[PDB]
C-alpha cells in the first residue's frame, strides 16, 4: 500500500494512492478539464509551482511520448487524478504514465474525489496545497507546507524557468506521417523573430517555424537594446508561469519595443506584459482558466473559437489605456482574451493559439503576426 | 450497452454484424470505466448482476465455446470475455480474437480476479475496506452475494453496517467548472454527495423500465413521463428513476429530479434512502419495476397505487383463478401439469385445441 | 527428457503416471535453461526441432485439446505447453492445469513470443544481433528455417555469413574453479571456446544414436563404444558424439574427446567444422546417424565406411529391388499401390497372404 | 538497449546488460561458486569493495527476502551474472532481484560469459575491474577506473564497515516454521560474549545466541582495556572485508586478550588477526576461496567438512609460531584453515561455521567455543 495524501491550506484532506515519486509537493492547486493532453499539460512550464488536478477520471490511457512534451521537463509541481488506468494503450506510447512521472521525480496521487476538489476550487477559489507520498504521510505536516507556501500572486516565475543563454530555433510542427521534422536551415526561413522565453511552449516555436520564422529564444531578462541590435523582423512574447506584474525587466524592454515600429506579438503571459507595457493592470483570477473547451469571441468578427486556456491572472478591461483595443473576450465569464495596440503593430492573446493539448481554432492569430512582419519589412 | 431479443427470433442468425439487430439499449454513468460498465450490465434487464458466468469452469469444452463467442460475436460476448479470463485466457489472447482494445480488456480481467478473491474469502472476508473497493468498482450487492454464497440482502445489510453507501454526482456538461441548478444524478462510491434532497415538498418517485425490448417499448416510458408531468404540475416533487438513453423519461426536463440509474432494488433503495419519498410508482414501467414491487415494499418503500399483493393476485395463475371463480366469471378450462403423460389426459379433459405454456 | 514409444502400443493408456512408461532418455547441457531445454528437444529423436506445433491456430477445438493434454499429461505435454501460449492461455492458466513451476513456464512463453517475431520478420528480419539472440536461447537452425519459411541450410549459411558459431565449454565438476585435462564438452553461444582441438593426430568421429527407443537400443551404443575403443587403441584420436546419459558411450573414459550434443546435422557439422576429422562413422548408432549420412557427405563431411549412397541403395525399396534383380536373387513378389482397388487387383498377382506396409 | 559493461585491469571487456542501478562500479573482481544463496552473499560485509561474479548462470530464481540478508545493506561493489530470470518463483520472495539491486542502488551486469571470466581469474588471479551501466558506457573510462583502483592489499576494510557504537544482540536463528525469532531477554542468556565487529555476518551472531550467548557488539578499534572491563565470558572475532594486516588496533587488542585466560575465537578475518596476534603472517591469495562446496579436513579427527568460504587472504602455515597448532586444512589447495593456541583457550576458523548461504557442516566449531566458555566460568 503506497499512500499519498493531499492537504489544502483550508485543512481539507484528500487520501489516496502514490503513483509517482516519493516525497512532498507544494504549490497552488488548480483544476484542468482537458479530457486529453495530460502529457502536454504536465510539460507546460506555465504550471511551474502548481499542483495539477485533472477533472477527467482516467489519466494515462495512452501512456506518453517525447513528441508530446512541450518543454524539456515536467513543470508541474504535482499531479492529482482520479484513476490511473491499468495500462497505456496507444501506438504512440513509449512509457506508462507512472514510470514517466517516476522518471521526472514528480509526486503524484490518484484515487481521490477530484470532483469534490474541483467543486471546492471553483466555489472558494484557488488554494495552495501539499501532496505527501510515502509510508506514513504526515497530514499536519502537509498542512504546514501548504500554508507556508508564499503564494503565486506577485511571484515572478518567468525568471525561474527562462533559458540561461540565448539560442536558435528552427524546428517545425509534427505530423502523423513524419513525426517531428528535422530542424530547418537558417537559409530556409525568411523571417527572424526573437522570442522572449518567459517559459516558452515548444508548440509555439514550432508553429512559428511553420510560418517561416527562424527564431532566437532569449532569456527573459534580455535587454531591449541587446535585442534591437539583432535587427529582428518580429518580437515574440512567450507564455510562462507566475505573476506577470513583478517582471519589471520585461515590461520595460517591451515599452521600448513599442517606441519602435517592430511587430510585437504575445501569448498568455506575453499578452499580460504587453498590456502592462501599455499601462494596463493585471489581476489574479478566482480560479483561473485551465481547460481545452473554452469559448472565446472574436468580438470584431463576431465568431467563436473553442480554446485551450491556462492562466491564473488576467488583464483588467476597465483599466485599459485607449491605445489598447479589445479584440477577444471569454464566453464563459467575459474576461479579456485579446487586445490590440491602436497606435502600434502589437497585439496579444490570452488563450493559446498554438494549443498543444486542444482545439486548433485559434491558430490564425499567428497569421496576423505574419502579415505585420511582412508589412514591417516592406518598410 | 445494446439490448437484443434473439430468443424471440429462433431461426435468426444471431451473430452481430453491420446490420443492426438490437431492440434497445441501456446506459450507465460511473466515475470510472469499471463502475460505469458494471452498472450498465446490471441495468440491462437481462437478468445479469454484472459479469455473471455463461460456461462452467468444469466444462471441458468451455474453451471451445468461449473461443467461438469471442471470435464471432453474439449478444453474449461481454459475458464470454469474463469467462475467458476465468478460464485462463490472456488479455492478448482475447484481443486477438475480438479486436476489442486491451485498454478495455484489462479492466475486465481485473474485475475477474477480484471476483475470484471474493469467492475465496467469502462474506467473512468482506471487510469494510475491501467491500468499499468492490463497490467503487461497480460490483452489485447481488453479484457479491452470488460470489460469497449469500443473499443479496446480506450484502446490503452489511453495507448499511459499515455506513457504506454511494454518493450522487450531477451532470453539468463542464466537469464541475460551473455550478448547476439542475438535478440530473448518477451514483458512485465517492466522498461528496451532490444529492441535497429537499425537505420542503411531497415526493413521488417514478420507476422506469430500463432498456426497450420487444413487449416493453416506448408505451411504458410514455406512461412514466405522464405520471411525472401530471404530478409535477400537481405540486409534487417528481423523481424519475431510469436508465434508457433513448427516452423522454430520461430528459432532465421531464421531472424535478432525475436519477440516471439501473432500475434495480439495490439502486432504487439507495435513492429512497435519501429521498424519503411520499410514494413510489411501480406500475408504469412495465415488467422491470413491476418485478421489484414486493421487495421494495418489503424493505419499507411507500409503494403507491395497486398493491404488490393485488398485482400478484392477478399475475398469479392460481390466485387469479380463485378470484375468477369467486366473481363467477368465465375463463377457459385449464390445468397445471408436471408430466409428459399427465398432460395427455388432462388435455383430454380440457379439449383440443390447447394452449401450451411452459 | 524421457523418450516414449506409445505409438508401438496403441491400446495402451498413454497418460503419464507413477509407473514409468518411457523407454529411454536424452540429456542436454546449455548455459541457460532455455538453451539447455531446446537442445534436448532437438536431440530427442522424435522429429522435433524444438517447440514444433501440435495443433493448428485456426483450429476451433485447439484450446480444448490443449487443455486436455495439459491437465492430463501424456508424452506430448511439452509441445502442448507451447501451443497453449500460441493459443492465448496465460502462464497462470497453464500452471493451474499443469502444476509445472512458473519459473519454467515463463521461459517457454518467451520462446513462443520470440518465434512469433521470427515468423513475422521472416528471414530479412534475421540480422546478426537477433539471430545471435535466437541461437543463444537454443533455437535450432531448423526451427528457425521453418518459421522463416526457408531451408534449414539457409539459416545455416546465414550463420556462416555472420560468423555465428557456438563455442565449446567443458564439464569439470567445479564451475571452472579448477583446471581440467578431460575433453568433455558441450555447445553454447558464448565468447570463450574451450575445444582446443589438436592439429597433432588423425581423428575419428563416432556418431551415437541419441536416446534409446524400441528397436534402437544399447546394441548400437555397444558398437559405438567398440569403434572408439579399437581405433583409439589403434592410435587414432577418437571423438564421440552422443547425448544419451544412460550409456557407456557418454562416459568420458570411452573416448579421447566427448561432445555431449544432439546427434543432428547442425550440431555435428559444427564439431566437424572445428575438428576437421579424418573420418566419420555414421553406421554404428542406429537410425539416428544413418539419416544424417547423405546430408553430412553433401556438406563435405569425411564419411568413412559404407557410403551414404550405398546405404540408400539398400534402404530404397526400389533401388534395392534392382540390385537383387541384377544379382538374380530371390525376393518375394511385391507391388507399390496408390489406390485401394489398385491393390485388390495387384494382390491377385502377388497372391495372399500379404504384408501391407505404408 | 539498457547497456552495461565490465572492464578488467588487463583491459579485458565483457559487454552485457544492466540489471541494477545506473552508474559505475569499481572493486576487486571475484568469483563465487555458490549455486544458491546469492542474497546472503550480496549482503556479506566481507564483500565490501568487491565486484562479485557468480558462476552459476541463473541468478535470481528465488527473488529476495529480509530473512536472507546477512547485514543491514549490500556490501558487494557490483554484481556480475550470466542470466537474470524472467521471474522469481519462491514462496519466500518479496522482491525480485533487479528491483532489490536498484533499491540498494547496486550496479549489476548480466548476459556475460561468466565462465570466461572465472577461468581468467583462476588462471591469472584476481583483478580489479569496473562496471559501467548506462546509455553509453565508456570502455576507456572503465579501464581507467579499474587501473586507478588502489587494490585490496594492505587495505583495512574492517574500520570502514564496523558499527559506530557498540550494541547488544540477543536474536536467535531462523526456522522455516517461525522465521526469524523475537530477540531474547538478557536474563535468558547465560553467557556474555563480546563481539568485535570487523564487518560481522548476522548469522554468526544468531548462531551464537542459539547457544545461549548474549552479545555485545563492538566497533573494530575498541580497546582491550575497555573490553575487559565488561567482564566478558568470551571474546569473539567476526569476519570482515579487506586486509587484516593493517588492522593494528585489532591485532594489539587481541594480543592483550592473549595475556588473559578468556576464551577467544575468530572466524575468517578474526581468524587471520588471531594468527597475526600470535606471530603468524598473512598472505594474499591468488584468487582466494569463494564458494560453498569447499572440502576442509579436521586434521585432528581426519574428517571432511563441505564448507562455505569467502576469503582472499590467508595465514601462512610455514610461519606459524610454535604456540600455534594446525587444526584444519583445505582439501582443494591444502591452504591453512584452522588454528589453535597450544598455550591458550584461543582458536579460529578460516571458513564460516555459520555459513549463511551454505553447508551446515562446520557448525560444531561453535561448540568448542561454548565449551571453553563454560570451562572458563567454572574458574
Ligand atoms: N449539488 C446541489 C447543487 C448546488 C449547486 N448550484 C452546485 O452546482 O454546486
Ligand atoms: N580446455 C582446454 C585445455 C584445458 C586447460 N587445462 C584448462 O583447464 O585451462
Ligand atoms: Cl436471420
Ligand atoms: K480515496
Ligand atoms: K553478452
Short mmCIF file of N, CA and C and ligand atoms in Angstrom, two decimals, chain B residues 11-13 21, ligand 3:
data_model
loop_
_atom_site.label_atom_id
_atom_site.label_comp_id
_atom_site.label_asym_id
_atom_site.label_seq_id
_atom_site.Cartn_x
_atom_site.Cartn_y
_atom_site.Cartn_z
N UNK B 11 -35.07 -18.97 -35.40
CA UNK B 11 -34.24 -19.30 -36.56
C UNK B 11 -33.38 -18.18 -37.16
N UNK B 12 -33.20 -17.10 -36.40
CA UNK B 12 -32.43 -15.97 -36.89
C UNK B 12 -30.94 -16.06 -36.63
N UNK B 13 -30.15 -15.55 -37.58
CA UNK B 13 -28.75 -15.55 -37.35
C UNK B 13 -28.57 -14.55 -36.22
N UNK B 21 -29.35 -5.48 -35.10
CA UNK B 21 -30.29 -6.46 -34.64
C UNK B 21 -30.80 -6.17 -33.22
CL1 LIG E 3 -31.80 -14.39 -39.97
#
